[PDB]
């Protein structure tokens, strides 16, 4: 619900919105193992009616040099749902300053709702 500092889970995305990292909190808050996601896409669990807009957030990723999506519904491991908002950050490669990975901060407004 409202307020909870420990309700956050880091993740990193490939420029194709694929999971390369997620913090173990994910299993607490959604029930996914970080690695269950690693190799797939976040758009898979995005609430469809938000997934488009969510994608546009990545389509932007330039306003502040960064983009932060709104509180959306993410599919829960066991077929429910959950509330978290994702902040996506371009992490560039120090050599050429080319976006190699996305620093994504996910934090839940609420735990699963089945």
From Swiss-Prot:
Q: How is expression of this protein distributed across tissues?
A: Expressed in most tissues, with highest levels in placenta, lung and heart. Selectively expressed in endothelial cells.
The PAS domain is annotated at 4-65
Query: Post-translational modification, briefly?
Result: The hydroxylated prolines promote interaction with VHL, initiating rapid ubiquitination and subsequent proteasomal degradation. Under hypoxia, proline hydroxylation is impaired and ubiquitination is attenuated, resulting in stabilization. Phosphorylated on multiple sites in the CTAD.
Query: Where is it located?
Result: Nucleus; Nucleus speckle
Q: Which residues form the PAC domain?
A: 69-112
Which disease shows up in the entry for this protein?
Erythrocytosis, familial, 4: An autosomal dominant disorder characterized by elevated serum hemoglobin and hematocrit, and normal platelet and leukocyte counts.
| Oligomeric and partner information | Interacts with HIF3A. Efficient DNA binding requires dimerization with another bHLH protein. Heterodimerizes with ARNT; heterodimer binds to core DNA sequence 5'-TACGTG-3' within the hypoxia response element (HRE) of target gene promoters. Interacts with CREBBP. Interacts with EGLN1. Interacts with VHL. (Microbial infection) Interacts with Kaposi's sarcoma-associated herpesvirus/HHV-8 protein ORF34; this interaction results in increased stability of EPAS1 and thus activation of its transcriptional activity.
Q: What does this protein do?
A: Transcription factor involved in the induction of oxygen regulated genes. Heterodimerizes with ARNT; heterodimer binds to core DNA sequence 5'-TACGTG-3' within the hypoxia response element (HRE) of target gene promoters. Regulates the vascular endothelial growth factor (VEGF) expression and seems to be implicated in the development of blood vessels and the tubular system of lung. May also play a role in the formation of the endothelium that gives rise to the blood brain barrier. Potent activator of the Tie-2 tyrosine kinase expression.
| Protein name per its UniProtKB record | Endothelial PAS domain-containing protein 1
> Which gene holds the coding sequence for this protein?
EPAS1
Describe which stretch of the whole protein the shown chain covers, with first residue, last residue and complete length.
Answer: 239 to 349 of 870
